[PDB]
Design a protein around this ligand. Structure first.
Ligand SMILES: NC(=O)c1ccc[n+]([C@@H]2O[C@H](COP(=O)([O-])OP(=O)(O)OC[C@H]3O[C@@H](n4cnc5c(N)ncnc54)[C@H](OP(=O)(O)O)[C@@H]3O)[C@@H](O)[C@H]2O)c1
Ligand SMILES: [Fe+3]
Lengths: 378, 378
């Protein structure tokens, strides 16, 4: 199965197409990061919204790690303003925050309790039809959240999932002026996220030729361009920006697997993209040792990069990490914390729904071992 | 820009998903090629419609390469039945005829002459919002009509387009059992159309990276699998079936170019896929010599197939036509008839909206030369 709800609008200066898209709307709410404010893209968007006749109200300064707490703060100002159009302008977390906001705005009754993918052996209640349009404008490259029907959300320190077609954005605007403001480390971290997403999407149980096309292109693009992007080349920034959305389209359809699950649960340690990169080569070694299907798919990606084998790809991924100064796991977190948490982390990873999609289902013990293998820098 | 209205359902035996898809509709009309009746798929589909609780009515035997008069034949039968869901099961011809029917069913005041892209120097009247749902189920591999917003009809030996997102299908079902009953020539002809779609979509002025991904995968898949499919390999049939839709998604977004325009205006000679194959190598040479952008883009494609240059790609296409027994143009039509028609085809091709998307705009006398080159088999 393959589909795409989101309309994509790409190109230098495509932020301006925002005027077309607000036509016929009256009250526009914009959530943005501070960096979007300080670089003047928020103003620029406010102009475009005004000159299309609509009222506009902005909130900037948003944390990462969205929560039902923080969404409480907003909802009155939100609910009083009476928006009929939401705009998210920033990273994954900003987009996910706006996505989560849409649900409580549009379905104020909805018991948060009842809708969250916390366990994979739990089956939450479905989310009704919502209504407010949602435009996503990503400033990083990136999380894939501008096309996905998923947002993550804390209700007091605990992480739940919301998953439904209803919060996949209606429109995504990809203007590479925005991601050209990423500091080098952020360009690195979020670009490795693309790579991990693509490789995982290619190797799930539910991959199709349609998602494969997108995954493969994102992979080749990151492999070829990310190092130049990190050094701040402007064209390379644009290419990786588009590839980030490609990987998004892929994992929207094919989903993800063990590596993302493992990153979710070690969130406390580090940024999402960085931990993913750290784990990937171990998850690949595991998958390839245990599944012929996984081994063949990795070889297919290797050939597409101009190599031959599954082992080529694993080694090339380790060398990419080394090249871009990705730290060992031992450098991010001391032995003592890590070791006392590894079992708890394994159990949570085991209850995550994404391991349903991984080409091999790992036992709790094998997850434990993988954490330890990664830590030893094995 | 990139988008996709159509929801794709793929897989062996995926026809059975018709049941889910018609649920809560009352009157379903199926328009089908003769081959779908003879080979049993039409009964199968009817059974699925029935068990979803709908009334079903089928018309089989819809003609290949339809002209405008097909509308007056079948429209009265559609009006009499009053469907609330149209299903098209057949090649691009059947799907195009169904789309056209939808237009005149939902919007009875329109006629073909108003709304078709007859002349790129006159704006046709726009098609209003339509309403009847349309499910496309292609049985060739393929025209890509199951995801495109176009319907192609002949008037006076010459093909014109109707183009609107309103006739992009809502759902496409890709079940490779269906194209397995194609005769070899039908497999060849529809398969080479996938290749031509992909190459033209890759080299228009409005190619994006998103349409590029789909275009490139379709090309690779065809290049590798079509010879085996033509011989009757069952796997290769499935692979090329999914590629045809990939190419359709590409050209839905990137459009097409001079090779399709020329084939439209020579439609009286032969079937569409065969004409496209014959012209392509000449169009490519022309574009490559006139445009550096086209040259570099053909080379990218050559590299992806494991060659190096634009020139390699042209040679590859010529060799593949040979290997598959594509006739020379001179076998299809006598010289004195062709040569008497050629100034008119060229002038009409020049007025085709598709030449605006080609990487260079030819003059009519350059088009006339192209036609004659192809005739000589240069
Ligand atoms: N809308 C668009 O975007 C678009 C783009 C490109 C081309 N086109 C159009 O599409 C048409 C060509 O479509 P096409 O290449 O799919 O061929 P087609 O013209 O629909 O069909 C060609 C022949 O194949 C036979 N057939 C089809 N499926 C079969 C199966 N499973 N088993 C056995 N026989 C089968 C049909 O025989 P029966 O009639 O006996 O069943 C028919 O005679 C042209 O009119 C062209 O203009 C449209
Ligand atoms: Fe075609």
């Amino acid at each position: 199965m393959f589909w795409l709800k989101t309309r994509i609008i790409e190109g230098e200066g495509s932020l301006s197409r925002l005027s077309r898209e607000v036509k016929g709307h009256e009250r526009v709410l914009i959530l943005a990061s501070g960096s979007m404010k300080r670089h003047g893209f928020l103003s620029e968007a406010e102009d475009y919204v005004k000159e299309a006749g609509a009222e506009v109200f902005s909130i900037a300064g948003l944390p990462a790690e969205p929560s039902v707490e923080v969404i409480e703060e907003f909802l009155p100002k939100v609910r009083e303003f009476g928006p009929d159009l939401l705009v998210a302008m920033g990273g994954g977390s900003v987009i996910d925050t706006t996505k989560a906001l849409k649900v409580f705005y549009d379905a104020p009754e909805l018991n948060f309790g009842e809708i969250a993918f916390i366990d994979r052996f739990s089956k939450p209640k479905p989310v009704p039809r919502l209504k407010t349009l949602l435009i996503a404008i990503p400033s990083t490259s990136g999380a894939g959240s501008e096309v996905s029907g998923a947002s993550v959300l804390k209700k007091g320190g605990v992480k739940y999932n919301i998953v439904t077609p209803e919060i996949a954005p209606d429109v995504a605007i990809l203007d590479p002026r925005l991601p050209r403001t990423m500091p080098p480390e952020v360009a690195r971290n979020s670009g490795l996220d693309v790579l991990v997403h693509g490789i995982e999407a290619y190797t799930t149980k539910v991959a199709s030729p349609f998602s494969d096309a997108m995954a493969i292109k994102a992979i080749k693009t990151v492999y070829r361009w990310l190092p130049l992007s990190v050094k701040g080349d402007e064209e390379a920034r644009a290419r990786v920006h588009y590839a980030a959305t490609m990987a998004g389209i892929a994992f929207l359809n094919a989903r993800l697997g063990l590596c993302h699950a493992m990153s979710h649960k070690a969130a406390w340690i580090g940024p999402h993209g960085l931990l993913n990169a750290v784990f990937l080569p171990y998850v690949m070694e595991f998958n390839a040792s245990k599944s012929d299907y996984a081994r063949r798919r990795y070889a297919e990606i290797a050939r597409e990069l101009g190599f031959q084998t599954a082992k080529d790809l694993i080694e090339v991924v380790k060398e990419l990490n080394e090249m871009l100064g990705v730290p060992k796991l031992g450098e991010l977190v001391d032995e003592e914390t890590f070791a006392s948490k590894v079992e708890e982390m394994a159990e949570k990873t085991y209850h995550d729904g994404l391991i349903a999609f991984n080409p091999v289902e790992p036992k709790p013990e094998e997850i434990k071992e993988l954490y330890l293998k990664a830590y030893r820098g094995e």
